[PDB]
Design a protein around this ligand. Structure first.
Ligand code: 4V7
Length: 163
């Protein structure tokens, strides 16, 4: 079962999941109804300018190792991964003036709306995601919320691999 999302081709390599419709609150306290995937799964993300290994559990990104053409290409893949993960901090990063998902049309997709929102500006997403101290894994680097490489700190779960 291969599928497309945010310009990437996803392929499940391990795990299984069941769907459950859930109501989540944004940072604006707005209710969104999302189709939540329950279960630990592993995927490959293949795009035109980036590729990744994604390890996720229910509404939680465990790890993402990204490889792409440059900073912008890698950032695009990170954004899709965070939205795909269905995490609460990704959902809570939706806040402020006019930052509302059009829900008067039930047939619309909140996942695509969240994607479009973070594609325009990932600064609140990347800042609100969290940062962790990383080990000295050679070949893989950490990446800070401004997409600066760091050998000591990175965005929680995120590693950059060389091409
Ligand atoms: O729910 C909607 N869009 C979704 C956007 C994300 C990908 C999703 N499609 C698909 N998602 C998945 C999927 C799996 C399968 O292992 N795990 C997931 N975990 C999180 C997630 F957001 C989607 C998944 N497996 C196969 C798919 F074709 C469709 N829509 C589109 C219009 C009607 C509602």
């Amino acid at each position: 079962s291969s599928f497309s999302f945010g310009g990437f081709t996803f392929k499940r390599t391990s795990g299984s999941s069941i769907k459950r419709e859930e109501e989540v609150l944004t940072g604006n306290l707005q209710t969104l109804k999302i189709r939540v995937h329950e279960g630990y799964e592993e995927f490959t993300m293949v795009g035109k300018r980036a590729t990744a290994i994604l390890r996720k559990a229910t509404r939680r990104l465990v790890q993402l190792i990204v490889s792409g053409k440059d900073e912008q290409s890698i950032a695009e893949a990170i954004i899709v991964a965070m939205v795909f993960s269905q995490e609460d901090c990704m959902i809570k990063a939706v806040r402020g003036d006019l930052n509302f998902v059009n829900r008067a049309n039930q047939r619309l997709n909140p996942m695509h709306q969240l994607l479009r929102h973070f594609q325009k500006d990932a600064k609140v997403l990347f800042q609100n995601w969290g940062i962790e101290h990383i080990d000295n894994v050679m070949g893989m680097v950490g990446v800070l919320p401004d997409m600066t490489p760091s050998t000591e700190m990175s965005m929680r779960g995120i590693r950059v691999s060389k091409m």
